Amino acid sequence: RPPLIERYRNLLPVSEKTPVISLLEGSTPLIPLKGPEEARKKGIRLYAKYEGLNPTGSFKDRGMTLAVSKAVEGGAQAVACASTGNTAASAAAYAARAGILAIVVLPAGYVALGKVAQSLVHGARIVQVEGNFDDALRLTQKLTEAFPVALVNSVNPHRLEGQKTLAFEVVDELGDAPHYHALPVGNAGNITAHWMGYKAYHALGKAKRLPRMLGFQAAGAAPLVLGRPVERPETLATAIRIGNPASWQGAVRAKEESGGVIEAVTDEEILFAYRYLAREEGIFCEPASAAAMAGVFKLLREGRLEPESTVVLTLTGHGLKDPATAERVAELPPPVPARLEAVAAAAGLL
Amino acid sequence: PLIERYRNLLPVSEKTPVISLLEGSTPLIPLKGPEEARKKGIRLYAKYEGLNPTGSFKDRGMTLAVSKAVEGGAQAVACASTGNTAASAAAYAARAGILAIVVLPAGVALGKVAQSLVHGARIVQVEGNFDDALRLTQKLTEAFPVALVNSVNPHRLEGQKTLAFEVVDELGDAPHYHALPVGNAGNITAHWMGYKAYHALGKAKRLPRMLGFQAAGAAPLVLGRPVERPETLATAIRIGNPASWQGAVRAKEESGGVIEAVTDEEILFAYRYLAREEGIFCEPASAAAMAGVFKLLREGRLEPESTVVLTLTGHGLKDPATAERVAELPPPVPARLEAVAAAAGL
Ligand SMILES: *Cc1c(COP(=O)(O)O)cnc(C)c1O
Ligand SMILES: *Cc1c(COP(=O)(O)O)cnc(C)c1O
To answer: Which positions are annotated as binding pyridoxal 5'-phosphate (chain B) (predicted)?
Structure first.
């Protein structure tokens, strides 16, 4: 696992003066999937780029390594965001690695300790303000303008450049870009970066073809499917519970230029794919990440994937990011006497 | 795949069905410090096993144990524990299309087994104690087509030995010292096996001194006798009678290393240090390895200019309870730039 910035140095906005703040993120496994049967019946091969195996458990590490490295190169004493999720955790981990502050501004009483616990252990400075979520974003902006603090939010150009490397790794591995590439779409910075990576590698000549990007959003938070912002987003897939994507334009360009789509999958569909990956492929990912697999199931049922094609799915986060969704009251059989036969019977071996 | 990468050094053949989640090949992250180490030119590297498919190094052993189990036509794998072994076993069982059985004493925080459950593991609770569950799992794997995938399965040790191969492959040689946590001691046994094997190959031009560490409240190998009431927030190494006891002692003696204890406070300190200073979030049991290095460092027991590798066994995401316990949310401040800057430490 080389530092991501070093693996693609000549293709990234870095110089010899750029301080490489790396946790050896990237270079994640591209697991060939066994099925599903719907796909095998048509010679369609699926590969899961397992981004949950990045340092903080999310693909965001790809963008953060570059963003914090550049921030430091600029003399920044800290980075900031107004996120309560995987962004804050990634920012905090890299800030810690750099020896600088990670600042997260949020409306008081909004988040639970459990959700920001990861970023806090990394020493994140979480500032709850007595105001609205608009007050937090705003105060964040001014912090970035009055002090040496870099904003590492969704639109940070460096986060997008770093996230582009995922496409590079896929082509390096497969020998070419896949026919299709599915992934979840929240603020849409990831699908925008994926498309950037593919176009860049294509121009470089390492990728002969360009994949059709397949973006999927939860039905309850599908502004890019609906073609309008969603004021009241909702879904068990927290990572993509977004009503106004920050990289809206980037997503639409990626979709259009790649000849792809951005469609919706229901929470039931997301939950189904979530279970499928865990029980059938042995891959535990976040519900939002599962949306990508739900998306492939959807198009397979609709007969919209060409036979004999290759499909790559970016499973964005690790299942451990959201234990709650995995801890529904199990309702396990009652205990059995400490007798072997009883045990084998309970284990279903008889 | 790990099994393919080290095919010639593992007990496999063309007949072995490879059940892999592409585990292994984890990052060997060079640590910035601590200062105590920089002071003596002692370089530290963290082999981050928390980035394996299920979040712990055990996947190294599980891929081999399950693959061999299937080679023998096993209809299932089983273990008498909660936590990482259960989760790793369940994930690979799912991958292979066979059952994962987890036998536990009756009377169980779903968090201890939620990860194995999401993979579809079958939990069987028996009305008896820990020994009854283990005794029953043993008899179960002897009578039925079920492989026992606990710390003493020989295939798990062989698979886990690969960690040493990778460390040598990347550094270009074996390190002067290799620290890691010790629960059932299968991991330290495997690490030594790996170094010995690479030594026979000429890959390692030196043998590292193995430095094992246990939580003070669960340090049987440090006390020379079993602990009937093991205690420690470091759940993964809260083991009173290590199943791979002799293997550990041999690793310690033959390598000229040690197996010492660190307190829960020292473990939390190392845990905070890794995340806050190196940006590495690991499970508390894993931090005991860094705690151990901190200990020998202040005792002046690590040769200057030497290389020290630490196996951080699991990912911090494995233990949210401890993370929440350590985390603290500051009180709200007014929504004013000066109040925010002040609180952000600017
Ligand atoms: C941030 C995140 C997303 C959403 O990605 P965008 O670039 O906002 O579209 C999806 N899944 C996970 C696990 C994430 O962390
Ligand atoms: C299993 C485990 C240990 C203990 O390893 P032993 O082989 O039992 O010595 C330590 N840390 C983690 C994260 C583990 O999963």
So the answer is: 84, 183-187, 313
